[PDB]
């Protein structure tokens, strides 16, 4: 015996409408996430600029100290 669908009333072509309506909401949330993400990630470039200044000063320090040790060792 085939399944006889009972008596309903509606609906059509509306739930798809409301579901597709939130495309603007999705676009806004995605673009907001992208903007805030780039803004909160580019600061690592400045952090690595700090890393570069630290490596430059440590390299100068090590050059000076190794020259000092070469001076104080070769008797």
């Amino acid at each position: 015996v085939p399944p006889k669908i009972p008596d309903g009333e509606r609906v059509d072509f509306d739930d798809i409408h409301r579901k597709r309506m939130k495309d603007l909401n999705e676009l806004q949330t995605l673009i907001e996430a992208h903007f805030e993400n780039r803004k909160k990630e580019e600061e690592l470039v400045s952090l690595k600029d700090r890393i570069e200044k630290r490596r430059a000063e440590r390299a100068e320090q090590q050059r000076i100290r190794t020259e000092r040790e070469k001076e104080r060792q070769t008797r």
Binding site: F35, R38, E42, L44, K48, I51, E52, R55, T66
Partner: protein, 55 residues
């Protein structure tokens, strides 16, 4: 005897740090160059979407 062991150990010890220092600074420079590449790529289409924000 053990004196010679100490001299050899200390002499070889200096070898590892100095060679690694140059590699460390090269790694830092390459990392920073790549990060700058990405940041330059980052802001362009970011502003393009800023213009494209709601058309």
């Amino acid at each position: 005897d053990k004196l010679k062991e100490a001299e050899t150990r200390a002499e070889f010890a200096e070898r590892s740090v100095t060679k690694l220092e140059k590699s460390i600074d090269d790694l830092e420079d390459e990392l920073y160059a790549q990060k700058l590449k990405y940041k330059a790529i980052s802001e362009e289409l970011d502003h393009a979407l800023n213009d494209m924000t709601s058309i």
